[PDB]
Assembly symmetry: C5
Homo-oligomer: 292 residues x 5
Amino acid sequence: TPTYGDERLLREKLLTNYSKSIRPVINLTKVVDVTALLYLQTLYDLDFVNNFIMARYYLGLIWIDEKLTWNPLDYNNITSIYLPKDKIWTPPIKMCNSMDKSEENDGVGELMLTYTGWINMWSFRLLHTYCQINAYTYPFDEHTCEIYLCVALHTINHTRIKELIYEDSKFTQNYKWDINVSGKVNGTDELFSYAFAPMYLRRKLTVGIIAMLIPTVMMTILTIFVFLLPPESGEKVSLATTIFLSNVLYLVQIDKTTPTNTKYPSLLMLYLMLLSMLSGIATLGSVVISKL
Amino acid sequence: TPTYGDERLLREKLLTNYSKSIRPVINLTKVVDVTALLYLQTLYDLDFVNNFIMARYYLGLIWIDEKLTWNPLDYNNITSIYLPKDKIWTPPIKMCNSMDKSEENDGVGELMLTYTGWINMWSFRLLHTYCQINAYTYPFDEHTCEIYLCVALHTINHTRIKELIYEDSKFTQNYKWDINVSGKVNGTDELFSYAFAPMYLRRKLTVGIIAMLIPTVMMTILTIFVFLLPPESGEKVSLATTIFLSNVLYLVQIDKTTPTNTKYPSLLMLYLMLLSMLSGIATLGSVVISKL
Amino acid sequence: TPTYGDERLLREKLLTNYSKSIRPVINLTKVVDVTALLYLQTLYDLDFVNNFIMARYYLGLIWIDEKLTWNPLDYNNITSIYLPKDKIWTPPIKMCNSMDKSEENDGVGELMLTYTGWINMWSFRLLHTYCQINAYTYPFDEHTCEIYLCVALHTINHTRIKELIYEDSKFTQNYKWDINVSGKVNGTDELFSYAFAPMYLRRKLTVGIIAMLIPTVMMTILTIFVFLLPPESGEKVSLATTIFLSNVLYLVQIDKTTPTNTKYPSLLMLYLMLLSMLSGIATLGSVVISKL
Amino acid sequence: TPTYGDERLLREKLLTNYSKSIRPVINLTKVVDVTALLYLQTLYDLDFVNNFIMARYYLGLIWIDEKLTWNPLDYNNITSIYLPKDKIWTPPIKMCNSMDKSEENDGVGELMLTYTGWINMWSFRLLHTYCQINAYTYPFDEHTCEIYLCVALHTINHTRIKELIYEDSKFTQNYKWDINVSGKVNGTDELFSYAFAPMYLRRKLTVGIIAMLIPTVMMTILTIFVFLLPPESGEKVSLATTIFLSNVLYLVQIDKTTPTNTKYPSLLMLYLMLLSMLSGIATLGSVVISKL
Amino acid sequence: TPTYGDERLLREKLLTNYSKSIRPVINLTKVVDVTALLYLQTLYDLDFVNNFIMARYYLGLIWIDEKLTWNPLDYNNITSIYLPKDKIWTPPIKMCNSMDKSEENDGVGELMLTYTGWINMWSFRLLHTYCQINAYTYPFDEHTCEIYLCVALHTINHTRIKELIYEDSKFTQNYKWDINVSGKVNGTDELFSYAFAPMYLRRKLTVGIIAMLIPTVMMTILTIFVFLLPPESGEKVSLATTIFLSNVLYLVQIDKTTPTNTKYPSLLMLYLMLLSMLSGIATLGSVVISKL
Ligand SMILES: C[C@@H]1CC[C@@]2(OC1)O[C@H]1C[C@H]3[C@@H]4CC=C5C[C@@H](OCCC(CO)CO)CC[C@]5(C)[C@H]4CC[C@]3(C)[C@H]1[C@@H]2C
Ligand SMILES: C[C@@H]1CC[C@@]2(OC1)O[C@H]1C[C@H]3[C@@H]4CC=C5C[C@@H](OCCC(CO)CO)CC[C@]5(C)[C@H]4CC[C@]3(C)[C@H]1[C@@H]2C
Ligand SMILES: C[C@@H]1CC[C@@]2(OC1)O[C@H]1C[C@H]3[C@@H]4CC=C5C[C@@H](OCCC(CO)CO)CC[C@]5(C)[C@H]4CC[C@]3(C)[C@H]1[C@@H]2C
Ligand SMILES: C[C@@H]1CC[C@@]2(OC1)O[C@H]1C[C@H]3[C@@H]4CC=C5C[C@@H](OCCC(CO)CO)CC[C@]5(C)[C@H]4CC[C@]3(C)[C@H]1[C@@H]2C
Ligand SMILES: C[C@@H]1CC[C@@]2(OC1)O[C@H]1C[C@H]3[C@@H]4CC=C5C[C@@H](OCCC(CO)CO)CC[C@]5(C)[C@H]4CC[C@]3(C)[C@H]1[C@@H]2C
Ligand SMILES: *[C@@H]1O[C@H](CO)[C@@H](O)[C@H](O)[C@H]1NC(C)=O
Ligand SMILES: *[C@@H]1O[C@H](CO)[C@@H](O)[C@H](O)[C@H]1NC(C)=O
Ligand SMILES: *[C@@H]1O[C@H](CO)[C@@H](O)[C@H](O)[C@H]1NC(C)=O
Ligand SMILES: *[C@@H]1O[C@H](CO)[C@@H](O)[C@H](O)[C@H]1NC(C)=O
Ligand SMILES: *[C@@H]1O[C@H](CO)[C@@H](O)[C@H](O)[C@H]1NC(C)=O
Ligand SMILES: *[C@@H]1O[C@H](CO)[C@@H](O)[C@H](O)[C@H]1NC(C)=O
Ligand SMILES: *[C@@H]1O[C@H](CO)[C@@H](O)[C@H](O)[C@H]1NC(C)=O
Ligand SMILES: *[C@@H]1O[C@H](CO)[C@@H](O)[C@H](O)[C@H]1NC(C)=O
Ligand SMILES: *[C@@H]1O[C@H](CO)[C@@H](O)[C@H](O)[C@H]1NC(C)=O
Ligand SMILES: *[C@@H]1O[C@H](CO)[C@@H](O)[C@H](O)[C@H]1NC(C)=O
Ligand SMILES: *[C@@H]1O[C@H](CO)[C@@H](O)[C@H](O)[C@H]1NC(C)=O
Ligand SMILES: *[C@@H]1O[C@H](CO)[C@@H](O)[C@H](O)[C@H]1NC(C)=O
Ligand SMILES: *[C@@H]1O[C@H](CO)[C@@H](O)[C@H](O)[C@H]1NC(C)=O
Ligand SMILES: *[C@@H]1O[C@H](CO)[C@@H](O)[C@H](O)[C@H]1NC(C)=O
Ligand SMILES: *[C@@H]1O[C@H](CO)[C@@H](O)[C@H](O)[C@H]1NC(C)=O
Ligand SMILES: *[C@@H]1O[C@H](CO)[C@@H](O)[C@H](O)[C@H]1NC(C)=O
Ligand SMILES: *[C@@H]1O[C@H](CO)[C@@H](O)[C@H](O)[C@H]1NC(C)=O
Ligand SMILES: *[C@@H]1O[C@H](CO)[C@@H](O)[C@H](O)[C@H]1NC(C)=O
Ligand SMILES: *[C@@H]1O[C@H](CO)[C@@H](O)[C@H](O)[C@H]1NC(C)=O
Ligand SMILES: *[C@@H]1O[C@H](CO)[C@@H](O)[C@H](O)[C@H]1NC(C)=O
């Protein structure tokens, strides 16, 4: 069986004439094809005001190193070792659409190398990735957030994202968003290789949403009556005043929640604006009636 | 008695042919069984809107190194030493359900080694761990937060969590949550070893909660009377208007506190929604009466 | 074709008598002319209360190194290599008008060197840059934010910003601000070289703005009527009281949004102040009428 | 007089056979007695909602090193030197009740060594230390925050906190809290040595607090009259309604300020709850009267 | 002319027998006199609730090294070089009244050395410096914030702040505060050397402030009339109720803005408290009249 000394010898031979900064190919004309695997662990939040989505991912990069092969029979049948990530060449992949808010405490700092040259490198990453949040159909809204991976500085002739496999680990259930992130896309080679995972998020119709809507619908009904109230009923003025005040409060509060950076406005905001306008017109009519 | 020079000699011999990156077993076929001990020090907070729990823990990992044994009689009876954590192999345990918000000022950076090879490594960790917060029975709500430990990258054939012993240190009393975190669980070996400590949290019925409820119950009574008020009492309109305004304010304020990511809705929110609906119906009936 | 060993030989020769801290000119009397390229990727936000603008840029510095030239025919036709940024002299350019909130996870840490001596060094930078935000014409407001680059400590006789090319990458569309940042400016040499990119930002007239304005205009109309209401109409007092309350609420809420550090005040704030003053005068007139 | 070369020789000899990781005693059976001195500089804040206190301290550790003695007559009368803190053994003292939010810009990173072996090591630390904040007697409330020092990992047989001397530097006056932190306590040796400084904080009766009291007392008086108002005065309904609305607003606002993690509730919260209940009962009585 | 090799030789000779941790004087009995130059670049904010002031400064330390002199005629007339700040002794000056929130991205990390021994070391520092904010005369308030520099650990017999020159760079204009920070003060030598720059800040009377006031003055007038309103006018009750509600809202909102840690209270808070008290007394008188 392999022993501690055998692996010490192997690690001594592997790193002898190895340069961490030279791309690991025998012939420099060859590209290193990196395959990326992005698995969502949990979707922490989807911030509308800041147009961001906060989530946690398991990102794994797989590639082949041609300087780091060995014959397992010469080392008591060692077929794979674990090296520190900072001793070996590693593809310069970046989350170039996101703020990577990971700590060093969540950093693995280690990779697995196989005797055939294949490296698997896995890590946890907390990402604040920018999303264009279209609140047009609020609260029945759907969004698409694209999480980008890209090769930092190297040309598509040096390092390439062969493929991006993106999935949902199903580690946690959200109960607020229906997440759909599953697929497999080739890399896009335009002066530098990149790819992105499309994450589709559909707000779930929790009856808390229904509770939020009940005041809106009943206030619409009540405003319809007060606008229909007889011209000289007797309580027109105060009733219309209070109802317009409530409508203004709702119109103010909805704006503070709906995003201001949207492709189209929320239909609910327009509906409440029209409702407040009609309430104001009803109060104006009541004032005119009082004049007469 | 042992002296400074004796320990200098011992530390010189221990680290001579030692590789920090090789797993510390004579035969590479043997697993290293790590036993983890997680003690709660203080539970800082249980953030409902963010679905997080912020707490401080004392985490201790115990394992055995077979490269780091010695005979105490050859070193003037030295039976244990303290080594910097970064000179020796340490298990790659991660809190893979948490944000580890510890500083380097709160990092011990040192471990204790015994002449038999047993290492104890203790640390303080401040964790923001994701919890699925079910506010269904608010404010009589109970929650379960699972704190996960997992071996980062290695297979269950290399490194394993033998056991996870989790307790409450009782260093501070909370006065807001009844914490129940005490037990001892074997690690789960599914392609990589992990375990989790279940923390049960029952909100304590402080009379501040009762103060928050008194307005709700008395407003229920008041709404019942105003809905029961005679059709032509004389103050029906204004009274019902103010009652509905207060009900809407309460329904709005409760939503800003109850979490929007919940398995089931809070019953109190539904109760206040129904109460506001009945208040609106009472105002509608008053309007109809005024019409007649 | 070039091989791994050829590039090892090249990198060994290049760095032999190279000093990272000496400015890279054969004759120390020559200046290093750096050309900077600033490309906006996404404009995250424009914070009015803090007078900041948060954005993401792709910054590239291009210069020429005279110690790091080679003949490609002596190295199997290698025409360019990639070096770690911390092994080579790099111009000390600073964003001396911004908080650089970039992480090490978003840091490229590598530059591309050509056989002629030309270095390209690219990076992603998240900048919180201070802007003097003039909310005079809110919500039809325009702003200019100047993003500064400057040579940290060296005199214009050592390092110089030859040029600054600034553009918009058009990676994302904003839907809230119309961004205009495109041009090319020579560096300014006054005891140390610097330059700045002017970013012109015009608020887009989204109909959400129109929804925000509708209450203001209709309240102006209604206040005009209530001030015009007959002296003894019958509901003057309560109507004017509620309308002044609403005007005060709007005047309070607008202040919390408009910035307090502005060259001139917002015209809308003055308009609402005058509207509230007229509402108060109307209530005063109603009180006087009630006295008579 | 001593010269640069003399101190170079001294520093060369002191560190010759010195091990930074070995506890600095000739005989390993001896304890190192550390004396800690904690001086408050300024108390930044006392956060009630988070149960924290933020302050700045100047912390000094004094101990004796037996490997680092010299005869000043052999070095041209050098009696003390200053060494970098990371070259020498320093006690592993932690603020194990606090979050240490200090930067490296506020880190001295240097200690003073005397020819007799005595080390003084001073530092500035910004601490967020957890406090159990009892708002029972708000706003005449007193609190006690214990700031803990403890030896990180070592047994009381290796490193001991001999003494903790804690004072107030009086650098700034607070005007909001009366701070009382002055004393001298032996360390507690229970499987590891620790100690704590008790900081007593009495809220100062600033008339801004009294101004906050003014509305509560006058509203109590007004509620007493409205509850005493004649059954058929004429304005009972509206007056009671508005007064109950104001009472509910006050009861809601006080809760958002008083902490929810308290040993006992604030008496002011209970008082306002009772007052709101009596206002509701008065409105109920008015409703009953209107029925009759 | 001097060449790359000449500077390589010079830098090789300068650092040969140089100790970065030894204070740079031939005779250890001599002090190193440091002159500090603090220039305000921009004043970001003056946070009243936290009692802080956030600003950006350009800080330059100038001193003389006696180990780092050379004859420029022996090095082809090289008269000054630039060294990395971490290779040379640097005075241990701290901003010991501030939180230094600077990043490594805004860190120059380099100093200029002249053949006569003189070192200039300049840097950008973003400081959060604690200020005792006296809101007594709000909004016509003036404040004094003292920014402290101090020698970290060394006695006045080793390192001294000879002088402190503070100015305003005038890079940006504030439009909210009139800043007056200009002067030149000797250092204070009391067991360790320190100095401070006094920054005087006078709130500018922007009409945004005048606008905030208009509601206060007109509400004072309106309260005066309602208190003067005839005992049986007819609308006394409702009018006084609404006036008191608005007064209470203003008194509540002003408190949330004025600081609670002040030498004296704000006069405006007392004025609004008195106005609310008089409004309450007017309502009490109206209640008494209704009783009669
Ligand atoms: C998630 C995404 C990753 C980042 C990204 O979108 C978001 O950001 C975009 C900006 C692009 C760069 C803009 C300018 C240049 C300069 C050009 O060289 C001219 C030099 C010469 C001019 O005068 C000197 O004089 C080379 C190409 C380069 C670097 C672009 C590369 C692709 C980039 C990085 C794009 C990329 C898709
Ligand atoms: C607290 C918890 C810790 C993290 C965790 O939940 C939360 O997150 C989950 C996601 C899981 C990984 C998903 C995908 C793969 C890829 C597979 O390799 C296929 C390669 C081949 C495919 O095509 C190449 O082509 C190897 C296994 C691995 C890495 C999973 C490991 C277990 C993980 C980390 C789970 C774990 C329980
Ligand atoms: C985006 C922008 C970058 C930063 C910046 O605006 C914002 O900030 C401004 C402050 C300026 C410095 C102020 C003072 C001095 C001292 C002087 O030396 C006298 C020494 C002698 C006095 O008595 C000793 O006794 C040398 C020049 C220097 C360092 C200025 C350089 C330019 C600076 C950095 C300006 C620059 C434009
Ligand atoms: C400000 C304060 C500092 C931190 C502190 O309160 C706050 O936190 C408390 C938690 C305590 C630890 C809990 C458990 C153990 C395990 C035990 O070993 C059994 C091993 C064996 C079991 O089965 C293996 O199988 C050794 C002692 C130790 C480490 C305690 C030390 C004291 C600690 C750190 C206490 C300390 C006072
Ligand atoms: C901006 C400002 C910088 C910081 C500062 O205000 C704010 O903070 C103040 C606290 C002071 C220290 C308090 C206590 C001591 C102990 C004494 O030694 C006795 C040892 C002996 C006792 O028994 C052992 O047994 C030596 C002096 C020292 C360190 C003071 C130095 C000056 C300091 C740092 C002051 C300084 C002005
Ligand atoms: C490199 O190129 C040569 C010639 O093209 C070829 O013979 C050799 O096999 C290549 N090396 C590898 C590893 O493919
Ligand atoms: C090497 O290990 C593999 C996997 O355990 C096994 O199948 C094979 O028989 C081994 N060969 C030798 C020579 O040990
Ligand atoms: C996810 O979205 C894609 C494209 O929008 C669709 O093809 C796929 O069916 C969706 N997945 C599920 C589970 O609905
Ligand atoms: C992706 O690349 C592979 C590799 O050649 C190719 O077979 C495939 O057609 C490409 N497109 C897709 C959608 O897989
Ligand atoms: C390693 O394996 C060999 C053969 O299986 C055995 O003799 C030896 O005792 C093992 N070493 C240890 C430390 O168990
Ligand atoms: C070694 O130390 C242990 C523990 O103090 C003691 O019991 C034993 O007698 C000692 N033996 C020798 C040889 O010193
Ligand atoms: C804690 O919870 C577990 C399971 O929910 C239970 O068995 C145990 O009795 C509880 N502990 C206490 C002290 O109630
Ligand atoms: C855990 O592992 C031990 C070790 O063999 C075993 O005896 C025990 O049955 C396992 N299960 C539990 C619940 O301890
Ligand atoms: C340096 O200066 C000398 C004389 O002025 C000149 O001959 C030489 O070409 C210069 N070197 C370079 C690289 O321009
Ligand atoms: C060197 O490479 C360039 C670019 O591929 C090519 O045009 C040229 O012919 C090559 N020369 C030799 C000698 O290989
Ligand atoms: C951007 O602004 C500059 C100067 O204000 C102007 O010359 C240019 O035309 C503008 N660009 C566009 C696209 O309007
Ligand atoms: C900028 O510098 C170049 C270089 O000489 C010069 O030709 C040009 O006139 C300068 N001004 C502008 C606006 O480009
Ligand atoms: C160490 O112990 C020996 C014997 O107990 C004693 O002679 C010696 O003085 C001790 N060393 C010190 C520094 O106290
Ligand atoms: C050493 O220095 C001390 C303090 O300055 C002084 O009292 C003593 O006389 C000096 N002795 C010698 C030999 O220099
Ligand atoms: C501080 O508190 C302690 C105990 O509570 C007391 O003995 C001491 O007198 C107090 N100090 C002052 C100045 O009141
Ligand atoms: C603290 O320790 C000293 C040292 O022996 C002792 O004299 C004293 O009695 C102890 N207790 C107190 C309160 O100082
Ligand atoms: C150091 O002191 C000696 C004697 O006091 C004196 O001769 C010498 O000039 C001094 N050195 C310096 C650099 O002042
Ligand atoms: C050295 O440089 C200075 C400044 O340029 C110049 O005045 C002087 O003549 C030069 N001397 C020599 C010998 O080069
Ligand atoms: C700044 O303040 C100082 C002292 O308060 C005063 O002497 C000086 O004249 C002031 N400067 C200006 C420009 O007002
Ligand atoms: C400051 O120190 C210098 C240096 O001796 C002295 O001339 C001056 O009088 C001192 N005071 C002031 C205000 O400059």
